[PDB]
Amino acid sequence: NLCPFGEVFNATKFPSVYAWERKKISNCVADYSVLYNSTFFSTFKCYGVSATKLNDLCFSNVYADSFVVKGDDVRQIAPGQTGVIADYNYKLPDDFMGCVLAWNTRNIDATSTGNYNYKYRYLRHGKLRPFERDISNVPFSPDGKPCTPPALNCYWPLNDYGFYTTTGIGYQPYRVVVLSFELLNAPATVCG
C-alpha cells in the first residue's frame, strides 16, 4: 500500500491551529521523495531525521498534524519556541522526532475583502504540553472566574486571523503539516 499523503497535503480543507487535526499513518509504504524535492514547500525542516535519508527507514506509525497559521507564525512551529501559537495552540516536544512542512496558500485561504475564519487561542490559563490540544471556547477571565460578556474583564479566548490577498507575505495564510515519526517496539509498518 502507498500511504495517503496526497489525502493529507492536498486535503481540500484545513483546520485552525487551536483546533489542529491529526491523522495517523500506518501499515503502508511511504515514498517521501514525493515531497522532499517539491519546490512546493517554503518550509521543510526535519529534526533528528534528515529529510533525504527519510525513505531509507522504517517506523511503527507516522502521525500527521494539519493546521493553518500566519506566515510570521510558521517559525513558532518548531521545538523550543514561545508565543501565542507555540504556547496556546500547538506545541512540539523538545526531543521532537519529525518534520514540519509548510506552504503559502494565499490564493486558497486568502480573500480580496479578507478571510477571518481561521482563528488561534490567545488567552489561556497555563500553556500546553507537547501535542496537547484545546478547543474549549469558554469566556476567559483573568481570575479564572466564569463570566459572560458584555461582562467586564471577560474576553473570548479565540482571536481571528485576517487573511487578505493583498498583504505582505508574513500576514498571508500558510498550511502546515507536522510529520511525527513514532518508534515503538512493535515492528515497522510504514517504510520506504
Epitope: 517554503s42 487578505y164 498583504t167 508574513g170
Partner: antibody
C-alpha cells in the same frame, strides 16, 4: 500610489525618534507597509512592518524591543519609533509597500536621521 | 538566520551584458527580488518574483532563479546602469533578507 515621509531629524544618543509615512492616496487600503534602513555606504536592512487594516505589526530580531511600528486612528499614516538611539543608528529610513510575493514595491523618498551629541 | 551572497563588484563594457548572482540555500524555493539603487537615490524594484519586470523597467533587465543561485541579467548595459544591485527574499525565520549588494561598473 506614492509615499510621503517626514523630514530629516537629528537626535542625541539614547533618545528616540519617530518617522511618519503617508500614502499619497490617503489610506494604505489592504496592503502592508515595511520599514527599511541604510547606514552611510552600507547595505539595506529590514526593521519591521505593519498591516494597517489588521492593526498588527512585526519586527526584526535585531530591533526587537527597540522598535514600535504603529498607525494613526484614521489608519492613514504609519509611524516608526526607534528607541535608545546610538550613532550606529544614524541612517536613512525608508518606508515601502510590501509586494505580494515577499518583496517591496513602492518606496518612500526616505528620511535621513542623524544620531550624535 | 538566512543569508544571501552577492559579489561586491562586476565590470562590463558598454553594450555587453552583465550578470549578477545571488547565492542562498535552496533560493529556488524562494521568490527573489532585485533592487537598483543609484548614487544618493532610493532603491527601485527592477525584478520581482524571480523574473518579472515591473511596468516601466526596460526589457534589458531579467532574472532567473533555480537551485542555490538567482541571477540578474542586464543586456546591452548603458552608463546609466551603474548602481548598486541588491537581491532580496523573505524567509519564515529571518523575515526579509537583503544581499550584501553588488556594484556595477561600466568600463570604457
Amino acid at each position: 500610489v506614492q509615499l510621503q515621509q517626514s523630514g530629516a531629524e537629528v537626535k542625541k544618543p539614547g533618545s528616540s525618534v519617530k518617522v511618519s509615512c503617508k500614502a499619497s492616496g490617503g489610506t494604505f487600503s489592504s496592503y502592508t507597509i515595511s520599514w527599511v534602513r541604510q547606514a552611510p555606504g552600507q547595505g539595506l536592512e529590514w526593521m519591521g512592518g505593519i498591516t494597517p487594516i489588521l492593526g498588527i505589526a512585526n519586527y526584526a530580531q535585531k530591533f526587537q524591543g527597540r522598535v514600535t511600528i504603529t498607525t494613526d486612528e484614521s489608519t492613514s499614516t504609519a509611524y516608526m519609533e526607534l528607541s535608545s538611539l546610538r550613532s550606529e543608528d544614524t541612517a536613512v529610513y525608508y518606508c515601502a509597500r510590501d509586494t505580494v510575493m515577499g518583496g517591496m514595491d513602492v518606496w518612500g523618498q526616505g528620511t535621513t536621521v542623524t544620531v550624535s551629541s | 538566520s538566512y543569508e544571501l551572497t552577492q559579489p561586491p563588484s562586476v565590470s562590463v563594457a558598454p553594450g555587453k551584458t552583465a550578470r549578477i548572482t545571488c547565492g542562498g540555500n535552496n533560493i529556488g524555493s524562494k521568490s527573489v527580488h532585485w533592487y537598483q539603487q543609484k548614487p544618493g537615490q532610493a532603491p527601485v524594484l527592477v525584478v520581482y518574483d524571480d523574473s518579472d519586470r515591473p511596468s516601466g523597467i526596460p526589457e534589458r533587465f531579467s532574472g532567473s532563479n533555480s537551485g542555490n543561485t538567482a541571477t540578474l541579467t542586464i543586456s546591452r548595459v548603458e552608463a546609466g546602469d551603474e548602481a548598486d544591485y541588491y537581491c532580496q527574499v523573505w524567509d519564515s525565520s529571518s523575515d526579509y533578507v537583503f544581499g550584501t549588494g553588488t556594484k556595477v561598473t561600466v568600463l570604457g
